Amino acid sequence: KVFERCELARTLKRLGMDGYRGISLANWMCLAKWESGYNTRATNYNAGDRSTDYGIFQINSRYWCNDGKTPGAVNACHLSCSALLQDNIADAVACAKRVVRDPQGIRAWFAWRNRCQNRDVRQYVQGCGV
Ligand code: NA
Known part of the structure; x- marks a missing residue:
């Protein structure tokens, strides 16, 4: 799924990303935008x-998910990397939270x-x- 901007914004908010460990929704959006173009x-x-x-x-398989x-990498999010390819971003959001x-x-x-900070x-x- 390639999210539309505002659609994603609300999706991330519903998933508890607004202010998560002090990170605003806008910072998460900018991240996703530059990382995959909301894809x-x-x-x-x-x-x-x-x-x-x-x-x-x-999210990189070297340390965060298992593929x-x-x-001999690691899986800090304890998830199959395949879960990061779901239209439903709950698993990815869970992993993003683990990362931060x-x-x-x-x-x-x-x-x-480079593009948000x-x-x-x-x-x-x-x-x-939002
Ligand atoms: Na912030």
């Missing part, structure tokens, strides 16, 4: 380390640091009723 099926193989980025938040084909519970928080995503992100949730 739950998005995937990106990393030829360098044989890992893959799954779903709307592009079996990544040579670490020291760095949302900075785990390089794209957030210290930016005017109001536009991501404007008119969404």
Whole structure:
């Protein structure tokens, strides 16, 4: 599924993402936007380390989910990476929350640091009723 902006905004809110560990909805939207263009099926193989980025938040198999084909990786979210390819983003949201519970928080995503951090992100949730 390729979410429409406001549709996703409300979906994330309903899932408890607004202010989760201090992270506004706008920061989550900007993240998903840059990571997959709001696309739950998005995937990106990393030829360098044989890992893959799954779903709307592009969570990496090296540490976050298990896909079996990544040579001796880990699964901190304790989920099959396939769950990150569902139209229903509850499993992905659960994993995103697990990711940000670490020291760095949302900075785990390089794209957030580069395209969202210290930016005017109001536009991501404007008119969404969130
Ligand atoms: Na915030």
